[PDB]
Structure 1
């Protein structure tokens, strides 16, 4: 679309020892007003893949239904060949770029988290078709407020455990609530390991307002 209507904010994503964790608040904004407060911005592509999206929510639903039908078509053949996280990330990049070349982009910034063949995958795909992989991602306002914290922790501790990554992601959500005006205090947390995809929440962060008095 040319003008995004209902949009979601930043999406956090971090890789840990044996999986990837993705978090995103459940709020769809219409300008500066929080219209829909209970929508999911994270989806489960398949057993090893999960996707998070920020930006136009209507464009995310279209992509979610297209991707979903691709997985069903692939599972209908039953030939032992399933889409890997990198293949889903590749397909998305081509789809995002194709739409941007026709001057009718899908106003979305996606985060792809997966786990295949003992390797965790974390991909990023923006609306222009700019794609890359990293140990920790953050879209929208997360790049300026959450990325700095996530990067600082991955510089001393490149390999994190499930508990470390999960609690580090909750510290980022707390900061996002404090400084992002388009965010909500109710988020979801999806984790992908060898057992599959697990979507948790609706969770809340614990805020402190001791500075109001001082």
Structure 2
């Protein structure tokens, strides 16, 4: 029961960012620190999930195959919105058989210069929005992305990166089952691209963290 932690995403002017770390855990064990968790689905779309990695693999396989087959047999290239709809129907169906997909998905993409971002949870709940997250992202990240998007006229690409990294840094600080190693995908100009892994700068040197002040007994 290889399982993925937090995923986060944010829309900016011209596209959308999705980010996660490259770790699969098993309970508390950090088992694989070099797994690429994001999956390209078709021409415009990218998905990721928190939860059971086996259930993510199975569900994205099924989806990627529908999308590639539909395109190859004359039925055109499915869009983010269509992919998203099909995902939510299958999540729901499985819940309805009591054999759930124990994952929470975030889906992103760009078609017709309109960026998509939405979430689907394991009983089939779906929503779109300017910022979505799964895992401890929903508790730790969303308060920051939401504050950031309060500004009027929206976010530039660079301001969207800065705030994505601050969230990453807090996950790394406060989420147990994480690591300092992340990728970002960027949907923009009707195509998705996945970056190389990177690390964020952290702080550990405050005077209030020193040995004498944190000592339980003087």
TM-score normalised by the shorter chain: which range applies? Answer: over 0.9
Counterpart position of 1:51: 47
8 Å Cα contact 1:48/1:194 also seen in 2: no
Alignment of 1:18-167 (within 5 A): 18-78=14-74, 81-157=76-152, 159-167=154-162
8 Å Cα contact 2:55/2:103 also seen in 1: yes
Work out the CA distance in 2 between the residues paired with 1:75 and 1:22.
25
Q: In the TM superposition, what is the alpha-carbon distance from 1:157 to its structure 2 partner? A: 4.2
* Partner SS state of residue 68, structure 1: helix
Instruction: Identify unmatched segments of 5+ residues in structure 1.
Output: none
Work out the CA distance in 1 between the residues paired with 2:11 and 2:110.
10
Q: In the TM superposition, what is the alpha-carbon distance from 1:195 to its structure 2 partner? A: 5.0
Instruction: Identify unmatched segments of 5+ residues in structure 2.
Output: 214-218
Aligned residues between the structures: 209
RMSD: 1.3
Structure 1 runs (4+) greater than 6 angstroms displaced = none
8 Å Cα contact 2:18/2:185 also seen in 1: yes
TM-score (norm 1): 0.94
Counterpart position of 1:187: 182
Q: In the TM superposition, what is the alpha-carbon distance from 1:158 to its structure 2 partner? A: 5.2
* Partner SS state of residue 51, structure 1: strand
TM-score (norm 2): 0.92
State the structure with more CA Rg: 2
Work out the CA distance in 2 between the residues paired with 1:39 and 1:157.
37
2:203 is aligned with 1:208: yes
Work out the CA distance in 2 between the residues paired with 1:189 and 1:169.
9
Work out the CA distance in 2 between the residues paired with 1:113 and 1:131.
13
Work out the CA distance in 2 between the residues paired with 1:129 and 1:77.
29
